[PDB]
């Protein structure tokens, strides 16, 4: 498709799709709490839909009506035995988190997914749960789906040190410690997603936290809450970058996620000298109104500790760095394939074909000077982030024409991306 080129102004008010991690936890916490839980602006994906059906098979009343999710709480020990095997689908979050939720369940369950889910090991979650007294086993020694679980009413508290930097393993143990009798400590290897810690304080739970060390008492009773799911910063960052980049522009984003472990993009904009406004902060759900206008940017250093907070935002950061005056260096980033990378190279090949300098590195990339972008042919290769990055880069092109092949991949996380951009140009 031929993308929109030569844009004079960008104005309007946008509300981005909800966060995936919070959308998953809203169903889990809503079911385990006592009373009614109402979820607003949930992420309407198949992975969140899988978790909703899993709890529905366990006996939890969940109503999906007109974009509003109404959950009737059963209690901390109110889940019932399902009629058949639980389908988790493609969600790695669903299979891992609920495994810790069913730790205090006095019945046998079966958890399965698709081919993509069945290839992923679950041994990192079964090891600590076995020490608590839960009988779990899968295929081979690395415990591949499907898994067979049998919990216990006499759950033991856990003192575990996590060998891997995973939030899904960390959250699974927290849901299990919420049912266990006594004091349980969970130690992180590195600072990761803390959405479970935020939602626990929301539903009436209690924790201490001692710099990586998470102490949780049990058993705990929770109360149903009014949940407004914060917008995904990953989806919002595409508009935050475009607002600073497009001439004579100002964009407002209502209630965008503001969690510390995912706000790496804000730290970049602030350092570059971008006019980013933060208003209307929601402290209980971690969300704030983000306003951005046209600004002159400067080159900054993005390295250690900052990387895990912006690892998903790397493609558009390079586009933001492309219009910045000076040199911006990204280092300490090699995880595009465990210790390889192809994401940076695709970002490079797509952007330097449009405008000036981008040089790939073994641990990141180097971007240099303000570039005047022109028309080029770009293929996404099944990536949603590349397509959205090229779409907002096309607005700067005044001469040539930007053609995007495989533009259907954008609908993976942002179905109304082109509909939102259309309202901003004419706004």
Tell whether residue 383 is among the known ligand binding residues: no
Do 413 and 322 reside in the same domain of the chain? yes
Do 25 and 173 reside in the same domain of the chain? yes
User: What are 242's two structure tokens?
Assistant: 């475009």
Tell whether residue 116 is among the known ligand binding residues: no
Do 291 and 377 reside in the same domain of the chain? yes
Query: φ, ψ for residue 145 (rounded to 5)?
Result: -55, 145
- Domain count across the chain: 2
Q: How many CB atoms lie under 10 A from the CB of residue 60?
A: 20
User: What are 368's two structure tokens?
Assistant: 């240099």
Q: Nearest Cα to 5, choosing from 325, 354, 363?
A: 354
Query: Using what technique was this structure determined?
Result: X-ray
Do 275 and 169 reside in the same domain of the chain? no
Last residue of a domain, one of 229, 264, 279: 229
Q: How far is CA 406 from CA 1, 379, 382, in A?
A: 9, 6, 7
Q: Domain range for residue 418?
A: 1-19+230-427
Tell whether residue 168 is among the known ligand binding residues: yes
Q: How many CB atoms lie under 10 A from the CB of residue 224?
A: 19
Tell whether residue 350 is among the known ligand binding residues: no
Angle at 319 between CA 362 and CA 401, to 5 degrees: 120
Tell whether residue 193 is among the known ligand binding residues: no
Do 317 and 395 reside in the same domain of the chain? yes
Do 146 and 293 reside in the same domain of the chain? no
The 3-state DSSP class for residue 223 equals: strand
Do 12 and 32 reside in the same domain of the chain? no
Rounded to an integer, what distance in angstroms lies between the CA atom of residue 110 and that of residue 91?
A: 15
Rg (CA), the chain: 23
Resolution to one decimal, Å: 2.3
Rounded to an integer, what distance in angstroms lies between the CA atom of residue 304 and that of residue 284?
A: 29
Last residue of a domain, one of 213, 229, 245: 229
Rounded to an integer, what distance in angstroms lies between the CA atom of residue 13 and that of residue 427?
A: 9
Cα end-to-end distance, the chain, whole Å: 23
| Residues across the chain | 427
Tell whether residue 343 is among the known ligand binding residues: yes
Peptide bond into 146 cis (omega under 30): yes
Place of tokens 């991306």: 417
Q: Is 103 in contact with 179 (CB distance < 8 Å)? A: yes
Tell whether residue 167 is among the known ligand binding residues: yes
Domain CATH code at residue 398: 3.65.10.10
Catalytic residues: 312
Tell whether residue 120 is among the known ligand binding residues: yes
Do 47 and 161 reside in the same domain of the chain? yes
Beta strand residue intervals within 140-237, DSSP E: 144-150, 159-161, 182-187, 213-218, 226-228
User: Which residues are CB-neighbours of 160 under 8 A, at least 6 positions away?
Assistant: 128, 131, 173, 185, 186, 187
User: What are 47's two structure tokens?
Assistant: 């992975």
Do 225 and 363 reside in the same domain of the chain? no
Do 108 and 208 reside in the same domain of the chain? yes
Read out DSSP for 264-307? Answer: HHHHHHHHHT--EEEEEEETTTTEEEEEEE---EE--EE-TTTG
Rounded to an integer, what distance in angstroms lies between the CA atom of residue 180 and that of residue 1?
A: 55
Tell whether residue 20 is among the known ligand binding residues: yes
Do 279 and 302 reside in the same domain of the chain? yes
CA dihedral of 207, 187, 287, 301, whole degrees rounded to 10: 150
Q: How far is CA 375 from CA 149, 241, 390, 391, in A?
A: 56, 20, 11, 12
Do 10 and 119 reside in the same domain of the chain? no
Last residue of a domain, one of 178, 195, 229: 229
């Amino acid at each position: 498709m031929k993308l929109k080129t030569n844009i004079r102004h960008l104005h309007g008010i946008i509300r981005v799709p909800g966060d995936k991690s919070i959308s998953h936890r809203s169903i889990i916490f809503g079911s385990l709490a006592e009373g009614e839980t109402k979820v607003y602006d949930i992420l309407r994906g198949e992975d969140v839909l899988s978790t909703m059906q899993v709890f529905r098979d366990l006996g939890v009343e969940i109503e999906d009506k007109d974009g509003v999710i109404t959950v009737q709480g059963v209690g901390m020990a109110g889940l019932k035995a399902p009629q058949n095997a639980l389908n988790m689908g493609n969600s790695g979050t669903s299979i891992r988190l609920i495994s810790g939720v069913l730790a205090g369940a006095d019945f046998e369950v079966e958890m399965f997914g698709d081919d993509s889910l069945s290839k992923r090991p679950m041994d990192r979650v079964t090891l600590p749960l076995k020490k608590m007294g839960v009988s779990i086993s899968g295929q081979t020694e690395r415990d591949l789906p499907p898994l067979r679980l049998k919990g216990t009413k006499n759950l033991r508290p856990i003192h575990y040190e996590l060998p891997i930097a995973s939030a899904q393993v960390k959250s699974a143990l927290m849901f299990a410690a919420l049912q266990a009798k006594g004091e349980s400590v969970i130690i992180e290897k590195e600072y990761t997603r803390n959405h479970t810690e935020d939602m626990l304080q929301q539903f009436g739970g209690h924790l201490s936290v001692d710099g990586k060390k998470i102490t949780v008492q049990g058993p705990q009773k929770l109360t149903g809450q009014k949940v407004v799911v914060p917008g995904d910063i990953s989806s919002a960052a595409f508009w935050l970058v475009a607002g600073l980049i497009a001439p004579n522009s100002r964009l407002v984003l209502q209630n965008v996620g503001i969690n510390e472990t995912r706000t790496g993009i804000i730290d970049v904009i602030r350092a570059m000298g971008g006019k980013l406004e933060i208003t209307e902060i929601d402290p209980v759900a971690k969300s704030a109104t983000l306003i951005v206008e046209s600004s002159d940017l400067k080159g900054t250093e993005i390295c250690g500790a900052l990387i895990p907070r912006l690892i998903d935002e790397l493609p558009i950061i390079a586009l933001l760095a492309t219009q910045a005056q000076g040199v911006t260096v990204i280092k300490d980033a090699e995880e595009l394939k465990v210790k390889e990378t192809d994401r940076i190279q695709v970002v490079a090949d797509a952007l330097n074909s449009m405008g000036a300098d981008i040089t790939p590195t073994a641990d990141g990339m180097i971007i240099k000077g303000k570039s005047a972008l022109h028309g080029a042919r770009v293929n996404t290769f099944g990536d949603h982030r590349i397509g959205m990055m090229t779409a907002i880069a096309a607005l700067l092109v005044a001469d040539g024409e930007v053609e995007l092949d495989r533009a259907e991949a954008i609908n993976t996380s942002y179905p109304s991306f082109f509909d939102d951009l259309e309202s901003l140009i004419h706004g």
